[PDB]
Amino acid sequence: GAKKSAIGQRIVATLPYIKQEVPIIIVFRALGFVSDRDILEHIIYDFEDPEMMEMVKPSLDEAFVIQEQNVALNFIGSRGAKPGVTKEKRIKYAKEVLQKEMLPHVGVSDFCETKKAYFLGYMVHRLLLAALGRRELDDRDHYGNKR
């Protein structure tokens, strides 16, 4: 924006059964990883790498208000089809979404938060690599990408 303009690259994650876009760091905190280091550890792998470290900084600055797991679940539930009124109903809807809708293939059980976190971090990693320019953008016509 005209005022700050320093965090222009915000990493945001659309989710199944959740209307508005959700900043990715809130999703990672909702998985059960509230620590900022504990999230950037899943996203960025070689810490001495300055580029990714700076490039994830906007997504970090854009969520300081949501700092606890249940607060994160409240945020992601506030975009449900019908959040209801009770805190512990929005909480349960967000847990059900992050359990069954978001990334089913990594798992659906109640003990796969770490797997879902690692995989979403890998997606943000691939997005950051496409941003910097290391890996090339994937191709839709390439027949290996079709089944």
């Binding site: 070689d46 990594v106 770490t114 797997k115 390439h142 027949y143 290996g144 079709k146 089944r147």
Partner: protein, 195 residues
């Protein structure tokens, strides 16, 4: 079974690994899901192929793609991958020998079939994602011989190039001397003939 074998060959489950040790960086995937990491990619992909050329993982389309610079291994076991049979070239020399051709020639008397050729590990099914990791020769008669070296590390070899053509385009004779639009027009008209 591939998940079990990977567990049994030092692939550290993603939950056990020290999370900073992910710069070991061979991020093994199965059907598109994280299953762990691995420190030795080269001695792992020489073991999944050695298995797929006899029997533990179905000799049919279980692809193994090691993307070297990206540092990933991608094992796909699912429906919808167009595979292709290609010979094997180990040390600039085919795995097919006259013994195989002689056994296949006497097909009706033997019980030697294509399946015995695939079990013998001389022909394997390469899908497309594995195709971007292999160096092919079109004809063994050349491209496996010596000159100013184009490629000294081939990995496979086409059975016969005329197998890139489909059914209705294998009818047209000398299809390399014609223009390509005319070849498509023949693939069209050849479906409208009487017989």
């Amino acid at each position: 079974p591939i998940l079990e074998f990977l567990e049994e060959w030092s692939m550290e489950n993603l939950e056990e690994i020290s999370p900073a040790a992910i710069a070991d960086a061979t991020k093994i995937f199965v059907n598109g899901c994280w299953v762990g990491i691995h420190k030795d990619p080269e001695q792992l992909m020489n073991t999944l192929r050695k298995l797929r050329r006899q029997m533990d993982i179905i000799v049919s389309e279980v692809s193994m793609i090691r993307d070297i610079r990206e540092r990933e291994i991608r094992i796909y076991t699912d429906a919808g991958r167009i595979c292709r049979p290609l010979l094997i070239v180990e040390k600039q020399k085919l795995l097919l020998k006259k013994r195989h051709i002689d056994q296949l020639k006497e097909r009706e008397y033997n019980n030697y079939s294509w399946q015995d050729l695939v079990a013998s590990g001389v022909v394997e099914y390469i899908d497309t994602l594995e195709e971007e990791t292999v160096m092919l020769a079109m004809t063994p008669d050349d491209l496996q011989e010596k000159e100013v070296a184009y490629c000294s590390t081939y990995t496979h070899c086409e059975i016969h190039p005329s197998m890139i053509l489909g059914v209705c385009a294998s009818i047209i004779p000398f299809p390399d001397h014609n223009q390509s639009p005319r070849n498509t027009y023949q693939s069209a008209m050849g479906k409208q003939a009487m017989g």
